[model samples]
Target: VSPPPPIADEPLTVNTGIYLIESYSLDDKAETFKVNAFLSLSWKDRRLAFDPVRSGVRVKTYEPEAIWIPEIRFVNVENARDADVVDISVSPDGTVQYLERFSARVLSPLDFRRYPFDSQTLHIYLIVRSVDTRNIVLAVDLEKVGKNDDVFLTGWDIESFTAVVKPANFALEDRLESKLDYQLRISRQYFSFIPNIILPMLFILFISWTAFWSTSYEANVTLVVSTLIAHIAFNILVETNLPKTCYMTYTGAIIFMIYLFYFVAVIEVTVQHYLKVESQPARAASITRASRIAFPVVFLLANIILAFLFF
Candidate 1:
């Protein structure tokens, strides 16, 4: 079967809609999200027209192979979608109605600059190719575009599901094509990140500050070095869970600041040890006590500024 012939040299507009049934497994590293949803397509075909009185029914059912259908595909899908025909109904006036449920993993890029506190808009692109016989365009049916209330992503809060409404009509490979944009908006649930990463990292930095109150070089060295090792471990732990990006994330900047704090603490420990050996305890005492207040205050101020900059 072929596409329905155009009535007046104009492209046939196939009305489309997506109803999300389930959404899950959003992978950060892969930049993919999986969704199961119903896809609806409607178009008019004069060849399929019939009289209700003659047919004895207002609508008629047909197998997918018995009639013409548009060739639709997803542009952003990782692979061809797995789909099954649900039903096909033809109205008396030649309006062909088609429905299918499909599962696909969409490859969409995510903005990770804000990271754990980030909000993202995931996209699904629906496209149709024009055949040599006739051109077909796509239109959005707003009434049929929606998501189920039970649909959810485990670590994210679903904000909304909506279509762009306007179709992108363009030429590809010397043929006309139409594409639609469907967006899923979501925000990360960051409560777990605080206790798991931020709070522990803060505690490690605070422990290193304790070295400022002590005079013994051996004890100070042990305190700062041990905490530095713990901080390194935390850094590694955090990095493993996130995808590497060219630009720095908010958390990455904070982690790097901690490294600088550790380096400065090491300098203080080394200077304290060197000054004691050189018989300059008073000079060393002045620097150590000064660091005791400076370290914490500067850290707080920097953190406040960082939070303001990012949020």
Candidate 2:
């Protein structure tokens, strides 16, 4: 059915609210989040007004097809929302309330600038098209906009879900449109990154430092080179878990820093070997002793610097 006729010259204002029932399947690579929610819409239509005493009912229930309902859609949805009408009730004065349970995979971009310890504000845009006969705008009903206490997303903590009350009215495709923004705030669960990724990576870097104490070129080569290869493996594994973004993340910077340390370690080992073979054993011993403390101290200092920059 067509949209309800506008009263006088006033544009229709459709009140909207979202009630999240379940939020899950938040995929980082896909840059999408799945949500199951109740979308509530309310508007006035004078034509639907009826006398309660004559109708023998204070409130009337009607099929969706029996009355005019505005076309409401999600602007950021990956595909069309899967929706089922839950109820439609009209009051005696012709105020209609519509509710539907819908599921949608919302496409929202994630900021990986500080990933693994990052916080993000995901968006859900709701929009309504202006009809040919009359313009339609959207308004947020604060009382109905909320999420269930049990709603959760795996591996991420749900911070808050809120709506921007003012609708953004703009001209699009030569037609006036009203859009509303809904925000979902979340932060990453970083404890898993420590034991599973960060600590293990640090251990590999620590293993490479063992070469500083060894004077044998062959043994030092095996220790440093093997740890470097293992670090590469860790780097590859970490990249696989995250989406490839143009910007470097906190962990990415650390991984890259370790690579530089490994390269420097290889150079130091080569120089020490050269000094020993050139009949300068005393000079080689001094360099090796200095590197023993220097490598770890610089690594620790760099880590602190990175933490301060990111946090």
Name model 2 segments beyond 4 Å from true.
236-243
lDDT of 1 by residue, 185-230 (tens): 9999868787888888899999999999999889988999999998
- State the weakest 10-residue window (summed lDDT) of model 1: 239-248
What is the C-alpha local distance difference test score of each model?
Answer: 0.91, 0.91
> For all candidates, what are the clash counts?
0, 0
User: What is residue 185's positional error in candidate 2, in angstroms?
Assistant: 1.0
Which candidate achieves the best TM-score against the true structure?
A: 1
Model 1: CA > 4 A from native: 236-244
Q: Candidate 2 lDDT (Cα, whole model)?
A: 0.91
Task: At residue 143, give the lDDT of candidate 1.
Answer: 86
| Per-residue accuracy of model 2 over 105-190 as CA lDDT, tens digit each | 99999988788778989899999999899899999999989999999988889999999999999999999999999999999876
RMSD after CA superposition, every candidate: 1.3, 1.4
